[PDB]
């Protein structure tokens with residue numbers, strides 16, 4: 001706990017490498033010449049367009065960040081929204097983002113985890129929160145998501161993934177041990193207590209809960225471009241980043257950002273956008 005708190009970093013530091021929306025997830029460069037900011041909106045659209053959202057439905061955002069996904073959903077689809085975050089800062093910002101919207105739709109932000117959320121919702125989106133949940137909680141997660149949705153329910157989960165050690169060993173022993181050590185660094189120093197799933201885990205746990213799971217979308221090339229821009233931006237802001245934190249924290253995040261770009265490029269990490277369809281989902 002204390003040792004993990006050593007890895008707490010100011011929101012101000014994150015602002016020195018992210019786009020103006022402060023999206024801390026894979027952008028979607030379609031078309032390829034989008035700015036990072038436009039690509040973060042495109043990634044939100046990529047997720048929401050999979051969810052068969054109709055006016056007056058309620059969308060649940062599990063890990064709602066700074067509220068960008070929820071705002072886009074209200075504005076584009078005329079839906080009610082509920083977001084879950086455990087960040088007090090993100091909670092306050094989401095309430096202000098949603099209050100700003102010209103709408104009669106209900107907007108709610110809860111400072112709580114999915115474990116404590118048991119209200120009926122139409123559709124669920126979760127963008128790069130899943131890596132915090134832990135393997136032993138995946139069955140409870142998919143069961144909760146299945147049970148709170150109607151017969152035509154759908155969910156997207158976007159998550160960074162690694163491969164089963166067996167599969168990693170297939171793509172060179174030297175690279176398997178080197179990748180495992182970097183993943184340990186990610187889930188120790190960058191996201192304390194994190195644990196990467198595999199795409200196969202994300203699929204099989206959904207199926208066991210009763211979801212239909214089509215072929216997941218790989219975002220690998222998009223995450224490479226995202227991490228290149230994040231790294232280039234942090235580096236261009238080096239002095240300011242050291243002033244707000246320390247040389248230690250700057251070096252840690254340069255290692256994270258360049259490191260991830262490398263292991264994504266070498267196809268030892270991936271990013272999967274998995275769609276989960278309830279049996280009564282529209283065709």
Ligand SMILES: c1ccc(CC2NCCN2)cc1
Pocket residue numbers: 024025128129131132160186187191194195196
């Ligand atoms: C391990 C734990 C959490 C995460 C989620 C995440 N947050 C920002 C970008 N990825 C990834 C990997």
Ligand SMILES: [Mg+2]
Pocket residue numbers: 022066093
């Ligand atoms: Mg902000």
Ligand SMILES: [Mg+2]
Pocket residue numbers: 258259262
């Ligand atoms: Mg490297």
